[PDB]
Amino acid sequence: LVEMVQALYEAPAYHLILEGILILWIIRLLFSKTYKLQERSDLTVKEKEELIEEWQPEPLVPPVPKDHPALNYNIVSGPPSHKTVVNGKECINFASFNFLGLLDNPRVKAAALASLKKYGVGTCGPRGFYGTFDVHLDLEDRLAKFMKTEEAIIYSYGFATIASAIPAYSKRGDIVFVDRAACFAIQKGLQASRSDIKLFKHNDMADLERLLKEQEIEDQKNPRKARVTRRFIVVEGLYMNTGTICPLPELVKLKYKYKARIFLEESLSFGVLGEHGRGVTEHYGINIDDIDLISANMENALASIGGFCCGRSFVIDHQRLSGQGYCFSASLPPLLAAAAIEALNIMEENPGIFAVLKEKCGQIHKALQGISGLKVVGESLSPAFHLQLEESTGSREQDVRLLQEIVDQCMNRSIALTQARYLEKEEKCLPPPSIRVVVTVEQTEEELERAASTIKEVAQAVLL
Amino acid sequence: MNVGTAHSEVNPNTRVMNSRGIWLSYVLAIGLLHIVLLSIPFVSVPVVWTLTNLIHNMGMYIFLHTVKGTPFETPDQGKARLLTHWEQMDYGVQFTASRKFLTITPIVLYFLTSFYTKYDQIHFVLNTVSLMSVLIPKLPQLHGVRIFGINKY
Amino acid sequence: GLYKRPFNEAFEETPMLVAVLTYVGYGVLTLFGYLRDFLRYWRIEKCHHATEREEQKDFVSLYQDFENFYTRNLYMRIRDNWNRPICSVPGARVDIMERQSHDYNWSFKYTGNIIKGVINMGSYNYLGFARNTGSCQEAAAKVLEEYGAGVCSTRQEIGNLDKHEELEELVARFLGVEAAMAYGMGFATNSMNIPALVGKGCLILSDELNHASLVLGARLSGATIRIFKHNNMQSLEKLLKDAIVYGQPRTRRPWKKILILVEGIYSMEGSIVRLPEVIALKKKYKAYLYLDEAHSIGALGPTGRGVVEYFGLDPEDVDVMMGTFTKSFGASGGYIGGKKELIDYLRTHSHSAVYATSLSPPVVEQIITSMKCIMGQDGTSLGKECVQQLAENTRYFRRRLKEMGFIIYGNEDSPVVPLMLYMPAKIGAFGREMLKRNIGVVVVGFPATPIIESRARFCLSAAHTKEILDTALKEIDEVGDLLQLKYSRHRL
Amino acid sequence: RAWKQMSWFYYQYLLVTALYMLEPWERTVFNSMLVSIVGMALYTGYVFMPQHIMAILHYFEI
């Protein structure tokens, strides 16, 4: 070997460079695993034209079946409120999410009319370009003070609120643990972001613990990647699809033990739970600072269009520049904002309406128990719950038809009920068909018991 | 401002090198660096040229092959969160006029600095190491690979 | 396709020296931003920002610092040109609350004084329907008194009203299509109806400058998205041919559907879509057409029916015609118009139809009154004077600015005038100088646009009198002399 | 008159070099570096390069 080294050293430089490049060439041939065939063919103009001519597209919309229950919309001849007229029949409203009866107060209408006189209807632009009014800032300050939180942000549409809040913080590569029974807005927000989604059983902290333990096991394998991966837990204060509350304290413990932030959705529970009606945090006594982001809409309780998100400035300031429903859309009309402000004033003046609503919900939930063919799904504290078929048929269409039969027969009996509506092909976890019962402080005890008796009679007559 | 206000493209960072007058600005920046290097009184010409080569190559490496991501919020949910600028360029198309220009210009600078350094061996090895450090990442095969897991995350 | 009238547009190229100086400015800003980031990291200079709570210091950082680079170093310096509050109706003249900052726009303090009578060139009221006194205001007040504000349910649920049916039938009459549907948000219309029409296995051909709502709606659906150059019929035809011929990418199969998303008027560019060519191409290649008509439904057309009337085409040729009431009619909302089968499928299978609260009664009443006034149901001479005045104002303003030596984008008919600034500092300089002279404008910078063109958008209106336009033009001339914004080589 | 022209030229310099949006100390840093580079370049040009350009300037002055 030494003699070979000396002989190689005896060689000129160009000769050795040539030998080296030849050896590199040999390596390239040896590792040229691609077996090219040396061919090239292209299509002909007539071939392209005939290929274009063969193609025939599908219709834009599929042919419609005439049996669609959703093809028929109930028509309300007037404002949806207590003693409404549905399909020309005078009824009592048990279907509209108007918990505090703030839709038809004279004060709310007066404030809305004053703002309409001052400003008009439209805002004519986004918040960036001369679409910010003083009413918007006033309402944001009022919401922040009401929720005992640093900052709040307003969207002009309930769906877009959470559907734009979620993708702003969760990006591609992060992990989101979301409850199985989550509203469609949360699902669309999670789809808009490209993060990894891990569903867990409804209100089951055992499954959440198992998933978090699996995630920690995966973190132990590649710590470098685990140091740049964020974890979120998206839950609802009061679920719409089931009517059940969520266990906050266990979620807070799991957050602080596994380093995973919490996003709370509080559309149903914003103005109905707690002594002062600030959500489920007052119901459980949890500190507001433990929850990173709280999202609600101003439609169910405040009886006006819009939505909002509340939190610390550190998290809220990001949405003013990353929320798509905020940056690329017109701001909320001033009269709706004034109505929301007046509703907040009314809620702050007297907090006994929440107790009244709680007691009415207790009465109606206790009275409704005992139907032969129907079962109540939901908690006693929920203002809106469900009635479901105890024994169901093989297919869903017959269940829907039976529920609509019950609804129509009740509506002929001066009780206006509604049936829960879903997108069958789109929902991640499709809930069973059910009849939705909604409670309002306007409803009297006699009306509630009359509704319970009528529902019992109609259900036992129809299911039998 | 916000991405998507006046253009639907998710990642504008992939077009900054295809704009108008960018190549002329790059060449003028190199020339201005050379002028301010000549301005130093006590430094000889070959040292000035090798400093020009080294500084330009170091800055080019730092900007193209070290900084990864985008300087602004992007609506594709951070698809290019880990890619460097050279990988983001032209959405991964490996050959393009901009890429050809950026690969060719350090070689021309190397030729000029070799001519002006009178082919000294020390300057040869310095400039060759720098040229290799710049030209190796430009290879199409060396796309999306971090050696020894450095600058991976 | 053929045009009955000449189709004039101009997009002048950037002077080379201007591009070089733009790059010089951006490089200086980037270097100083890196220096400021280095100073802030080592706590040499105290950071004026909010931080994570002490109990969550061991969590993974919520944001990535580099993504906020341009926000910390470029946006924050000229932050006072945006989010300007107003305390008056957004008419031809608006009142702006005055604010000042002492820490270089990191925080704003509100002074008591109020700027009054600022000429409004930023609001979207094309036909001047944003008024606090009128017939529409009285109708909205009556409907607010009767129905209240806001509905508390969904359309498929008890939340469907008679006002909504009246609005839908009136909109269908106004457009000329068989049927139409109305929603409570223009963004939501696209984002919630595009996923319904197409899905996995279909192709979406999207223009280069589509709105964020159209892009989000296309992303939410599982379809494949391909982008063609802005108003480039050659690129559209090439994409259509390749899509039909070569099939799906991995497993070569015929496409289930092909949908073309286009807009009537592109706001930032200022151009009008070549509708006859697009219609001819879609007829030849058997594609479907989605037409976003937010900026042209009231501005364009002899009677203000939109782009299809502007080109004198047949509304039955466009498969889906979407539109927004915010721009022209002065009230929030949106609509989709088309054939009856499409509208029924949308009423059954739309996200906003099932899960979202419907419109507000005062808003629908204001829309109804405004659109009746536009189509002349009231019998008053108004509704034609607005369109004629808008056309005259657009023509006069565009001609006067083009003969002053400025660079302007778009057609001669579009009521949106993008003036060109081309440099990062001139953005803030123009905004501040124009506000100092009582003109309100909108300025758009780098990350929104391409790097070399940064612009200022003027939105004309039918409520702008001739004296207002003359005052604005003389102030614009003075500022253009001050900042040297007259880059045009053709005429000056 | 001439002072107004010089102030206008300084304003244009600020606009072109993007110094308009920077804070005063950043302007100070940039200006100091610029004047240092110009002075060093003039010193080098005088010491090493022949004063042929100086002769041209003198001829133009005369």
XYZ file of C-alpha atoms in Angstrom, chain C residues 93 119 396 464-473:
13
model
C -68.032 64.205 3.870
C -63.735 64.550 1.765
C -63.950 63.402 -15.247
C -69.494 63.699 -4.970
C -70.368 67.064 -6.487
C -68.163 68.831 -9.019
C -66.689 71.280 -6.502
C -65.659 68.404 -4.221
C -63.888 66.703 -7.124
C -62.163 69.956 -8.107
C -60.942 70.577 -4.552
C -59.678 67.006 -4.269
C -57.924 67.293 -7.635
